[PDB]
Write an enzyme that holds these catalytic residues in place. Structure first.
Site: not given
Ligand SMILES: Cc1cc(-c2cccnc2)[nH]n1
Length: 281
Positions: A159, A138, A142-143
């Site tokens: 994350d 992922d 955003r992470n």
């Protein structure tokens, strides 16, 4: 029981911090916190949760705790013996990368070299993950998190929920970050993260735009499987776009590993014609 880097760990190896030492300061949209006084981020597990969530929350702590790298957020400890359960993480004052890029879009501040340093930072963490046989699944703006908004910022991977889940649906799969073999066949390798990194590179040099801007998940799926790829971000230098297109090779074995990505990013930081390119207002 979690395994990584040739060892197996358990809830016991985590560093339990007595709840009495932990103070919440703010919501962060996760909380800013103090540990007596160390400043931390506090990830909370809702008391209103299933027993899958419990296992999930625990596994994330073990995963993050076994990384030792400057571009991966540090885990400071846990507070699992009191409710709500806490994971204590390095505090990243710059916030998430996607928001930082949007808030910091040049307006009536940021230069090409700054974006390349963010890209390099994350590529360096991805290399460490690949060298240790960890598939993130992922990689996306955003992470990622930034230590500070100003100069001298360091970007880190922040994350690990996806790697923990497959250790939750079709409409929730990060399809726009996934290579064909991943959303067609469910195959994940280090070359899965290489593809995603290319999408993240596009997010970085578009300054926080959503990938495949006007397309939906299914449309991207059919676009990508047919060989379609995104155009360069506005003003993107060709050497940078060439890194993206290499990451997006249809065959995983034609994609570069992260050692070569890093190599090519550093070559970009050396090209005046690249780093003297103006970002759009
Ligand atoms: C794990 C973590 C999350 C953060 C954070 C997020 C948003 C804004 N400011 C800090 N720091 N550390």
């Amino acid at each position: 029981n979690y395994c990584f880097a040739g060892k197996t760990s358990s809830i016991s190896d985590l560093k339990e911090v007595p709840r009495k030492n932990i103070t919440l300061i703010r919501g962060l949209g996760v909380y800013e916190g103090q540990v007596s006084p160390l400043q931390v981020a506090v990830k909370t597990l809702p008391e209103v949760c299933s027993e899958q969530d419990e296992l999930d929350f625990l596994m994330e702590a073990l995963i993050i705790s076994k990384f030792n790298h400057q571009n991966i957020v540090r885990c400071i400890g846990v507070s699992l013996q009191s409710l709500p359960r806490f994971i204590l993480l390095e505090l990243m004052a710059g916030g998430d990368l996607k928001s930082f890029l949007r808030e910091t879009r040049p307006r009536p501040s940021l230069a090409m070299l700054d974006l390349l340093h963010v890209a390099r930072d994350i590529a360096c963490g991805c290399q460490y993950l690949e060298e240790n046989h960890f598939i993130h699944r992922d990689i996306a703006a955003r992470n990622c998190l930034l230590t500070c908004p100003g100069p001298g910022r360091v970007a880190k991977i922040g994350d690990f929920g996806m790697a923990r889940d497959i250790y939750g649906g079709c409409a929730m799969l990060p399809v726009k970050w996934m290579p064909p073999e991943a959303f067609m066949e469910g195959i994940f390798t280090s070359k899965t993260d290489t593809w995603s990194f290319g999408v993240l590179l596009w997010e970085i040099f578009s300054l926080g735009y959503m990938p495949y801007p006007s397309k939906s998940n299914q449309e991207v799926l059919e676009f990508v499987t047919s060989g379609g790829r995104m155009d360069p971000p506005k003003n993107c230098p060709g050497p940078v776009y060439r890194i993206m297109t290499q990451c997006w090779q249809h065959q995983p074995e034609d994609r570069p590993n992260f050692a070569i990505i890093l190599e090519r990013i550093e070559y970009c930081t050396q090209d005046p014609d690249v780093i003297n390119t103006a970002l759009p207002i």
